[PDB]
Enzyme design. Structure first.
Site, mmCIF file in Angstrom:
data_model
loop_
_atom_site.group_PDB
_atom_site.id
_atom_site.type_symbol
_atom_site.label_atom_id
_atom_site.label_comp_id
_atom_site.label_asym_id
_atom_site.label_seq_id
_atom_site.Cartn_x
_atom_site.Cartn_y
_atom_site.Cartn_z
ATOM 1 C CG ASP A 76 -7.463 -0.848 -4.799
ATOM 2 O OD1 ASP A 76 -8.689 -0.807 -4.648
ATOM 3 O OD2 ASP A 76 -6.824 -0.066 -5.566
ATOM 4 C CB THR A 77 -3.559 -5.162 -7.124
ATOM 5 O OG1 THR A 77 -3.175 -6.066 -6.157
ATOM 6 C CG2 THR A 77 -2.696 -3.905 -7.102
ATOM 7 N NE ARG A 136 -9.224 3.564 -7.180
ATOM 8 C CZ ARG A 136 -8.777 2.431 -6.759
ATOM 9 N NH1 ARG A 136 -7.680 1.878 -7.288
ATOM 10 N NH2 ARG A 136 -9.466 1.755 -5.854
ATOM 11 C CB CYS A 175 4.010 -9.524 -8.797
ATOM 12 S SG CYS A 175 2.645 -9.865 -7.654
ATOM 13 C CG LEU A 176 8.118 -11.473 -4.731
ATOM 14 C CD1 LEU A 176 9.091 -11.447 -3.563
ATOM 15 C CD2 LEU A 176 8.389 -12.694 -5.618
ATOM 16 N N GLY A 177 3.040 -11.748 -4.793
ATOM 17 C CA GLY A 177 1.730 -12.193 -4.278
ATOM 18 C C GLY A 177 0.821 -12.689 -5.364
HETATM 19 C C1 HEM Z 1 -3.469 -9.482 -10.076
HETATM 20 C C2 HEM Z 1 -3.336 -8.408 -9.257
HETATM 21 C C3 HEM Z 1 -1.969 -7.809 -8.922
HETATM 22 C C4 HEM Z 1 -1.187 -7.107 -9.809
HETATM 23 C C5 HEM Z 1 -1.720 -6.594 -11.114
HETATM 24 C C6 HEM Z 1 0.069 -6.822 -9.141
HETATM 25 C C7 HEM Z 1 1.054 -6.040 -9.671
HETATM 26 C C8 HEM Z 1 2.343 -5.950 -9.126
HETATM 27 C C9 HEM Z 1 3.500 -5.166 -9.662
HETATM 28 C C10 HEM Z 1 3.388 -4.395 -10.925
HETATM 29 C C11 HEM Z 1 4.531 -5.339 -8.771
HETATM 30 C C12 HEM Z 1 5.897 -4.612 -8.823
HETATM 31 C C13 HEM Z 1 5.779 -3.139 -8.382
HETATM 32 C C14 HEM Z 1 7.110 -2.434 -8.340
HETATM 33 O O1 HEM Z 1 7.863 -2.509 -9.330
HETATM 34 O O2 HEM Z 1 7.512 -1.767 -7.342
HETATM 35 C C15 HEM Z 1 3.984 -5.986 -7.609
HETATM 36 C C16 HEM Z 1 4.627 -6.113 -6.374
HETATM 37 C C17 HEM Z 1 4.285 -6.945 -5.382
HETATM 38 N N1 HEM Z 1 3.100 -7.615 -5.325
HETATM 39 FE FE1 HEM Z 1 1.754 -7.724 -6.775
HETATM 40 N N2 HEM Z 1 0.157 -7.553 -8.027
HETATM 41 C C18 HEM Z 1 -1.129 -8.080 -7.812
HETATM 42 C C19 HEM Z 1 -1.550 -8.818 -6.699
HETATM 43 C C20 HEM Z 1 -0.803 -9.027 -5.571
HETATM 44 C C21 HEM Z 1 -1.240 -9.782 -4.474
HETATM 45 C C22 HEM Z 1 -2.621 -10.385 -4.317
HETATM 46 C C23 HEM Z 1 -0.385 -9.526 -3.448
HETATM 47 C C24 HEM Z 1 -0.530 -9.906 -1.976
HETATM 48 C C25 HEM Z 1 -0.375 -11.177 -1.515
HETATM 49 C C26 HEM Z 1 0.771 -8.882 -4.073
HETATM 50 C C27 HEM Z 1 1.949 -8.578 -3.383
HETATM 51 C C28 HEM Z 1 3.063 -8.160 -4.026
HETATM 52 C C29 HEM Z 1 4.360 -8.077 -3.366
HETATM 53 C C30 HEM Z 1 4.660 -8.631 -2.025
HETATM 54 C C31 HEM Z 1 5.078 -7.211 -4.210
HETATM 55 C C32 HEM Z 1 6.493 -6.706 -3.986
HETATM 56 C C33 HEM Z 1 7.505 -7.382 -5.011
HETATM 57 C C34 HEM Z 1 8.893 -6.818 -5.116
HETATM 58 O O3 HEM Z 1 9.358 -6.119 -4.175
HETATM 59 O O4 HEM Z 1 9.633 -7.220 -6.026
HETATM 60 N N3 HEM Z 1 0.468 -8.612 -5.414
HETATM 61 N N4 HEM Z 1 2.757 -6.595 -7.980
HETATM 62 C C1 LIG Z 2 1.283 -2.154 -5.064
HETATM 63 C C2 LIG Z 2 1.977 -1.549 -6.263
HETATM 64 C C3 LIG Z 2 2.324 -2.760 -7.156
HETATM 65 C C4 LIG Z 2 1.324 -0.337 -6.965
HETATM 66 C C5 LIG Z 2 2.392 0.115 -7.967
HETATM 67 C C6 LIG Z 2 3.688 -0.052 -7.220
HETATM 68 C C7 LIG Z 2 3.232 -0.641 -5.863
HETATM 69 C C8 LIG Z 2 4.418 -1.287 -5.067
HETATM 70 C C9 LIG Z 2 2.546 0.501 -5.144
HETATM 71 O O1 LIG Z 2 2.996 1.059 -4.106
HETATM 72 C C10 LIG Z 2 1.237 0.748 -5.849
#
Ligand code: HEM
Ligand SMILES: CC1(C)[C@@H]2CC[C@@]1(C)C(=O)C2
Ligand SMILES: [K+]
Ligand SMILES: [K+]
Ligand SMILES: [K+]
Ligand SMILES: [K+]
EC number: 1.14.15.1
Length: 405
Positions: free
Chosen positions: A242-243, A177, A348-350
């Site tokens: 942050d997320t 932000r 999402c992979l985390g």
């Molecule tokens: C509950 C909270 C979180 C939400 C709401 C969230 C949301 C998302 C969304 C919307 C995507 C896809 C973004 C895109 O289309 O480019 C994404 C990607 C990703 N998230 Fe999360 N996420 C969260 C927590 C985390 C955590 C804790 C991690 C770290 C370990 C993480 C790591 C990733 C990774 C590695 C990707 C890339 C996936 C891809 O390339 O297909 N996320 N997440």
């Molecule tokens: C971490 C996120 C899921 C958030 C929306 C798309 C993303 C890959 C970003 O770069 C900000």
């Protein structure tokens, strides 16, 4: 100062929506987008705010711009181009299907097993914080739980000491932000100056942390470079500080005001996994986007190369055409329809670590601390962005309601 209107945009789609100052902000920083889903408002709109951009108002139109990824790219997702140009995160800014090996590596840098490596650490730390707070009747939850719970798991997962937390929680927020101090280029180059002596340390001596998986992954017939280890770490770093921290904050910015939604989880602990999934429908804190890579036909209009579209998660999440009972909240989900993990090629992979973190928090708060509210006088100010935020969350409760566990 609003933008001029492009030559290819006709006026009947105009809505001058501002991404960082959303028009119904007092409803909550996901519900504050809901006005875009009024009957007269098409499936596609354009605004003059924020340098001028399309917005997709509905879950179908959103997903149909994640499904033509070959035309809609994440090489620039930030609608402020000065931050979209600076961006380059991995897997996301790399083109599939030839992304495949970067994401396979991600899925073994963080996956369902890692949640099993930290679960008891999750557990005992939610227990030990929420035992420390139990009889205390108040806290500012953004700082007394939500920041130091998951960050003290992600730091320990990556192998970094606690003493860099306010320095990395400073930088993450400067990327996610617009405060004013650092640009995305600035905050990113500052992150990377700090993390590449650590990634190099992970080449000199690999270890039982995740960065030592990031730095030694083999991809396209070669090593994963530092150039690419730093960019895949930037994602994860937005991920775990942050997320999952802001999501935690929003989840209690609802249960604060919600005596029945708390009771529903006390009478029936088996709604706790379904209430997170509805919380992930409802409080879907993200305002993502993509760039057009060719001149392309959409919704009755031709779009041009270098066009950018916002595809807000909460306009799948709240949309009457996707989700049954979308403004009302209940936790009896069998199924649900939203983009708070993206779609098709992106997934999402985390977030399965955060799922078990929130679900531990949910099941171990509603015991020690069953009945509670936000402090009187306190008004909660919400911050819109590519990930949305809040200022501060001062909770209160009576010590005499609280149970020793
Ligand atoms: C509950 C909270 C979180 C939400 C709401 C969230 C949301 C998302 C969304 C919307 C995507 C896809 C973004 C895109 O289309 O480019 C994404 C990607 C990703 N998230 Fe999360 N996420 C969260 C927590 C985390 C955590 C804790 C991690 C770290 C370990 C993480 C790591 C990733 C990774 C590695 C990707 C890339 C996936 C891809 O390339 O297909 N996320 N997440
Ligand atoms: C971490 C996120 C899921 C958030 C929306 C798309 C993303 C890959 C970003 O770069 C900000
Ligand atoms: K509507
Ligand atoms: K397709
Ligand atoms: K305190
Ligand atoms: K803090």
């Amino acid at each position: 100062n609003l933008a001029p209107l492009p030559p290819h945009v006709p006026e009947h789609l105009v809505f001058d929506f501002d991404m960082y100052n959303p028009s119904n902000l007092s409803a909550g920083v996901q519900e504050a987008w809901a006005v875009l889903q009024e009957s007269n408002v098409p499936d596609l709109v354009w605004t003059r705010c924020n340098g001028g951009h399309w917005i997709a108002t509905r879950g179908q139109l959103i997903r149909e711009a994640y499904e033509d990824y070959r035309h809609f790219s994440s090489e620039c997702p930030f609608i402020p181009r000065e931050a979209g140009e600076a961006y380059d995160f991995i897997p996301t800014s790399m083109d599939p299907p030839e992304q495949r090996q970067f994401r396979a590596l991600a899925n073994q840098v963080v996956g369902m097993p890692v949640v099993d490596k930290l679960e008891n650490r999750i557990q005992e730390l939610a227990c030990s914080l929420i035992e420390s707070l139990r009889p205390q009747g108040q806290c500012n939850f953004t700082e007394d739980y939500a920041e130091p719970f998951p960050i003290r798991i992600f730091m320990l997962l990556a192998g970094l000491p606690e003493e860099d937390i306010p320095h990395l929680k400073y930088l993450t927020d400067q990327m996610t932000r617009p405060d004013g101090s650092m640009t995305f280029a600035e905050a990113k180059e500052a992150l990377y100056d700090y993390l590449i002596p650590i990634i190099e340390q992970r080449r000199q001596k690999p270890g039982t942390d995740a960065i030592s998986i990031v730095a030694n992954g083999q991809v396209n017939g070669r090593p994963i470079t530092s150039d690419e280890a730093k960019r895949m770490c930037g994602l994860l770093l937005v991920g775990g500080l942050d997320t999952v921290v802001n999501f935690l904050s929003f989840s209690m910015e609802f249960l604060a005001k919600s005596p029945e939604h708390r009771q529903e989880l006390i009478e029936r602990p088996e709604r706790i996994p379904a209430a997170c999934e509805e919380l992930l429908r409802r409080f879907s804190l993200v305002a993502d986007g993509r760039i057009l890579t060719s001149d392309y036909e959409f919704h009755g209009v031709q779009l041009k190369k270098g066009d950018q579209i916002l595809l807000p998660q909460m306009l799948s999440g709240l949309d009457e055409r996707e989700n049954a009972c979308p403004m009302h909240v209940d936790f009896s989900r069998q199924k649900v329809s939203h983009t708070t993990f993206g779609h098709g090629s992106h997934l999402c992979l985390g977030q399965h670590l955060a799922r078990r973190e929130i679900i531990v928090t949910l099941k171990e708060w509603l015991t020690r601390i069953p009945d509670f509210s936000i402090a009187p006088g306190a008004q909660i100010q919400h911050k819109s962005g590519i990930v949305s935020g809040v200022q501060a969350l001062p909770l209160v409760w009576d010590p005499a309601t609280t149970k020793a566990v």
